[PDB]
Amino acid sequence: MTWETWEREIENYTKQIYKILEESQEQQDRNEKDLLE
């Protein structure tokens, strides 16, 4: 595997992780709101 592919893979998984972290934050938000009310 080339470092070029390695870099692309790093960027891709990093992008996906941040998407999942955003979803997780949003769901944590919903769950905390639901609990408090």
Binding site: W6, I10, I17, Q28
Partner: protein
């Protein structure tokens, strides 16, 4: 439903991070094979 959904979200995050971790292991091994 929201708690179960969040468990899925956290599982997906950990799985995605494990892929990133495997890429870093590959990179360390690549560098190790050149340097030493």
């Amino acid at each position: 439903s929201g708690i179960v959904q969040q468990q899925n979200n956290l599982l997906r995050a950990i799985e995605a991070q494990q892929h990133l971790l495997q890429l870093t292991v590959w990179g360390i091994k690549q560098l190790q094979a050149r340097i030493l």
